[PDB]
Amino acid sequence: SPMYSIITPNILRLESEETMVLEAHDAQGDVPVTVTVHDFPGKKLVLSSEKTVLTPATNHMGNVTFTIPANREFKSEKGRNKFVTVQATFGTQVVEKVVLVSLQSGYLFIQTDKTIYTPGSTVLYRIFTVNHKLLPVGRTVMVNIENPEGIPVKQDSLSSQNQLGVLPLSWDIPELVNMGQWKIRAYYENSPQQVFSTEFEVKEYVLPSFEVIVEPTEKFYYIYNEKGLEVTITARFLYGKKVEGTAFVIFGIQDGEQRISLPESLKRIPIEDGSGEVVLSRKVLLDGVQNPRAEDLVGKSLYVSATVILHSGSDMVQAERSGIPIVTSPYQIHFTKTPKYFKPGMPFDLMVFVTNPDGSPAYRVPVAVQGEDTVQSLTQGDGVAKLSINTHPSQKPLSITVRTKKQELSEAEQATRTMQALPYSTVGNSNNYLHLSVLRTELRPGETLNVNFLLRMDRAHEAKIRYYTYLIMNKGRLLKAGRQVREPGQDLVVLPLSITTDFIPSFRLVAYYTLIGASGQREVVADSVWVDVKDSCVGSLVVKSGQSEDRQPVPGQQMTLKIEGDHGARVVLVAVDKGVFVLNKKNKLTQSKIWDVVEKADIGCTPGSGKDYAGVFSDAGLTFTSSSGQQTAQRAELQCP
Amino acid sequence: MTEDAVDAERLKHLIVTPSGCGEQNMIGMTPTVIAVHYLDETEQWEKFGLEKRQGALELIKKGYTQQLAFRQPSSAFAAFVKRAPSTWLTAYVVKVFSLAVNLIAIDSQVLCGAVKWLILEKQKPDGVFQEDAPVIHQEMIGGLRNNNEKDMALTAFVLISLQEAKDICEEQVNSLPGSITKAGDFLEANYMNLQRSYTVAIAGYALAQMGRLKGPLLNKFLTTAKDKNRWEDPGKQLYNVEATSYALLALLQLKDFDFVPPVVRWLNEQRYYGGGYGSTQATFMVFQALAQYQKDAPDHQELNLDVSLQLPSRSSKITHRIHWESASLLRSEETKE
Numbered sequence A: 001s002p003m004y005s006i007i008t009p010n011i012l013r014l015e016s017e018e019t020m021v022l023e024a025h026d027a028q029g030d031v032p033v034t035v036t037v038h039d040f041p042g043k044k045l046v047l048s049s050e051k052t053v054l055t056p057a058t059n060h061m062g063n064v065t066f067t068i069p070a071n072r073e074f075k076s077e078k079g080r081n082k083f084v085t086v087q088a089t090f091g092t093q094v095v096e097k098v099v100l101v102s103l104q105s106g107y108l109f110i111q112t113d114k115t116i117y118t119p120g121s122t123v124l125y126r127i128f129t130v131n132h133k134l135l136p137v138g139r140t141v142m143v144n145i146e147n148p149e150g151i152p153v154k155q156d157s158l159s160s161q162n163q164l165g166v167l168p169l170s171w172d173i174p175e176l177v178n179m180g181q182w183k184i185r186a187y188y189e190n191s192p193q194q195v196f197s198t199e200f201e202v203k204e205y206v207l208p209s210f211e212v213i214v215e216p217t218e219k220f221y222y223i224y225n226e227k228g229l230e231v232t233i234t235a236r237f238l239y240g241k242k243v244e245g246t247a248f249v250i251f252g253i254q255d256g257e258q259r260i261s262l263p264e265s266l267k268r269i270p271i272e273d274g275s276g277e278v279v280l281s282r283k284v285l286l287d288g289v290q291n292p293r294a295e296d297l298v299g300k301s302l303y304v305s306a307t308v309i310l311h312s313g314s315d316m317v318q319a320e321r322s323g324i325p326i327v328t329s330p331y332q333i334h335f336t337k338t339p340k341y342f343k344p345g346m347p348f349d350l351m352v353f354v355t356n357p358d359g360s361p362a363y364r365v366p367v368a369v370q371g372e373d374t375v376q377s378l379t380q381g382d383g384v385a386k387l388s389i390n391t392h393p394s395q396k397p398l399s400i401t402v403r404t405k406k407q408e409l410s411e412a413e414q415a416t417r418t419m420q421a422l423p424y425s426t427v428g429n430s431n432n433y434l435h436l437s438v439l440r441t442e443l444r445p446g447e448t449l450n451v452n453f454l455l456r457m458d459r460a461h462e463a464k465i466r467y468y469t470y471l472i473m474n475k476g477r478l479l480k481a482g483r484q485v486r487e488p489g490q491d492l493v494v495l496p497l498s499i500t501t502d503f504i505p506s507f508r509l510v511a512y513y514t515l516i517g518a519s520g521q522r523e524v525v526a527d528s529v530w531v532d533v534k535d536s537c538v539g540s541l542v543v544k545s546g547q548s549e550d551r552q553p554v555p556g557q558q559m560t561l562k563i564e565g566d567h568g569a570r571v572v573l574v575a576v577d578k579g580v581f582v583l584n585k586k587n588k589l590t591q592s593k594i595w596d597v598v599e600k601a602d603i604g605c606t607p608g609s610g611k612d613y614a615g616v617f618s619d620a621g622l623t624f625t626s627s628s629g630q631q632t633a634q635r636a637e638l639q640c641p
Numbered sequence B: 001m002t003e004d005a006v007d008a009e010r011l012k013h014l015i016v017t018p019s020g021c022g023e024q025n026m027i028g029m030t031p032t033v034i035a036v037h038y039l040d041e042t043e044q045w046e047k048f049g050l051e052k053r054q055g056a057l058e059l060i061k062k063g064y065t066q067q068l069a070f071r072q073p074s075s076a077f078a079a080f081v082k083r084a085p086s087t088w089l090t091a092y093v094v095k096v097f098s099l100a101v102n103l104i105a106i107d108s109q110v111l112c113g114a115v116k117w118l119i120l121e122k123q124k125p126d127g128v129f130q131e132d133a134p135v136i137h138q139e140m141i142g143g144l145r146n147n148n149e150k151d152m153a154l155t156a157f158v159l160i161s162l163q164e165a166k167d168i169c170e171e172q173v174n175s176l177p178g179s180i181t182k183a184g185d186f187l188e189a190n191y192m193n194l195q196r197s198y199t200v201a202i203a204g205y206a207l208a209q210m211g212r213l214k215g216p217l218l219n220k221f222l223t224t225a226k227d228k229n230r231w232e233d234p235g236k237q238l239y240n241v242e243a244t245s246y247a248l249l250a251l252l253q254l255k256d257f258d259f260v261p262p263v264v265r266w267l268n269e270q271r272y273y274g275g276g277y278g279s280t281q282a283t284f285m286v287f288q289a290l291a292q293y294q295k296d297a298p299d300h301q302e303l304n305l306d307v308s309l310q311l312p313s314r315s316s317k318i319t320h321r322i323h324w325e326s327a328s329l330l331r332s333e334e335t336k337e
């Protein structure tokens, strides 16, 4: 009997367009099907619309798009997990699979013009309302402002209808207010448990007149180095001029949450030409702490608290840099991107995330496997270095350790890491694999891609398979489905792919086929892969000055500035003096933060592959149910371990 | 201030498929129905297994479809069509259908006809109910196996059966209040002379369901408890658990929260999971009582405050209300003087 397969996202979202790809294998003729959704438990009949018929001309393919209504029954309970039932009626065959339903229904981004506000001054913040697809949406937003001790002071109830997703709001701080770290928190009406927040502080400040940046030569301190830590002070006026003053430097060890100061490291270096340097002899660092041991200092950190004073004795600026690590190794190895399951007798990919000790990705550092060290590669601009190891067709797990092989360094300084990968497990030990080898480079929208489908099966069953089914995730929901044909005998099939601007920032690709094997038992083999895309705006907004002459405009003199953006869009602007950024540069907003939030809000957390087909689909964030009885695992936790 | 419930880590055995005649059909489907009701009310399907719910629903749906064959043309039910209709079996059908109205499409006409058939000729004018067809196996009726005060307990059970389906067939049957009054008078007349805590508990539950269990009857009910934590009967402990479930349901109806927690703690202490011969009714109604502990579960909060302030300026006296949903609703007000 032909098998009917329904693929839906593993987590559903209220008030959103969620697709449900309907596919049938070996179907004969037109097979109409109506999809219905029922609450669990009970039967509340939330939605049973969007029925679709199937056609053999379109390879029995079809996707239904709808939106789960938001009712008080879902909002009645907010502290426990809730589920719904999706049921499909493939003619005379019935299939139904339960699925978890979350309460997230969009994102909130809070932009404040400044980051520090004096008492008695106004506050201007904008609330951005976007959905799971990062589009303007009309909802209801609650806004609250909380003082540092945790007491709401002002609450509102706005609506994003007719505002095109931008809600400008203002608030007036009383002239007599307890200073500290104020907080602004907002949440959607449907999901009061989901709280978004920003942080702005109230201070008794006056704007400075210059910026001080302390940049050590290397973002670390080698423990065995004899010269010691070197830090360079670069004091520059805000309006692009150099400083002639004097500076004070003090070095302290930051272990845990307790800061230990070094009285003997204080120096008075005269900054000249907007530059200066100061040394820290290793003897001072060793003797400052009680224990003269060396290895105990590993894991701690240093911080520089530089104070700069002009020769005129007018203004003082305190600039602090903290978090410089004390690590015996100038490099770090991470395996957050490498798949945890390989395929026996099949090429295996090893994405190594080589990064600087502070956390920033490294660049152009060689890496190599310990065994058969002839394999070498260099990290790209993103801090990821490709690797390739040939895997023997043995069911025994394989252990891989990688070690950087940069020259001019000893064997002790190179960072090491060890990883254990489990072999892919089939059904009935039929030795049926699928692998998907794909380019993983600094991909950009528009540039093409070449997915390499690599089937591996015995010649007795190489003719039953006649196609492939592949899906593309993006931001938690599907983006595109399709069938890639494969005539018998063609071992390798290439699938051209169009990476548009909608694939930002990381699309997860899955692929699977099906046939009858063993002694008449239906089975499925699947695969998944993780691909990165350049993090940039879906559109293109650029701000540039129209006036190309009359350098350094006089105050009070006009200029014209162009806004190059996509047509029909709404642009919000804000001009901020750089003094406040000198005195506070945290809790801002940028494209990187937005993409980090979107990536964090994903549904799967295993970069490709898995223990088995059910594991692969569960990790990829999809549930797969068949008419025959084949099914994936069960997901009942919002946050993966 | 509410005792914990069963985690259902060993409740998977309650899924028994219907088989055989109507009696065996109901014996098989009773644990499954009561288990799915308990799981739905407790919202414990996450740990019990989400995929078994659809299978259990299909099981109960096809069992409900199959049992309709045994229905007599007079809207009556029995083990076999040839066999005479049984009053207790019909009351049990009423219980099951009124419990499963939310899960299966129960025919309202069938239940209304059954209730009318029971009222018109299956009861005495005084309200006493008579059993015109004993079931094949006496182990499933529960406390009616013993002949002592059998008619009184049967009358109390049928009174509960008719009182638990008030809104189902209120308009169709107009003689229901008369039967209710007759049964209540009959039960209250002979409540003191009861010697079995099973009969005492069932009579107390029936009388408290409509409010006639007051004064000396309530005092006798309270004193019926053994060591103030359990109900005891001669014989096996199954009758003790049944009487405890009777008392628990009666107390939940009476909304007396100072004595329920010991009862539910004791019931969980024995951990009566059911199974075996002559245990369908006891397991069914003990899980039913556990379910009635849920949904309408008493909670410690009684937040209905009405807060008002007398402003010295007297421009506007601010008044608000604090409730359970607004327990953490912090209110900030500022005065300049």
Ligand SMILES: *[C@@H]1O[C@H](CO)[C@@H](O[C@@H]2O[C@H](CO)[C@@H](O)[C@H](O)[C@H]2NC(C)=O)[C@H](O)[C@H]1NC(C)=O
Residues within 6 Å of the ligand: A061, A062, A063, A480, A481, A482
């Ligand atoms: C999933 O649904 C979308 C809904 O639009 C389908 O997109 C359409 O695809 C056809 C051909 O594939 C185009 O002619 C239409 O213009 C598309 N619609 C829009 C609005 O652009 C999509 O094809 C569906 N997926 C599959 C595999 O069929």
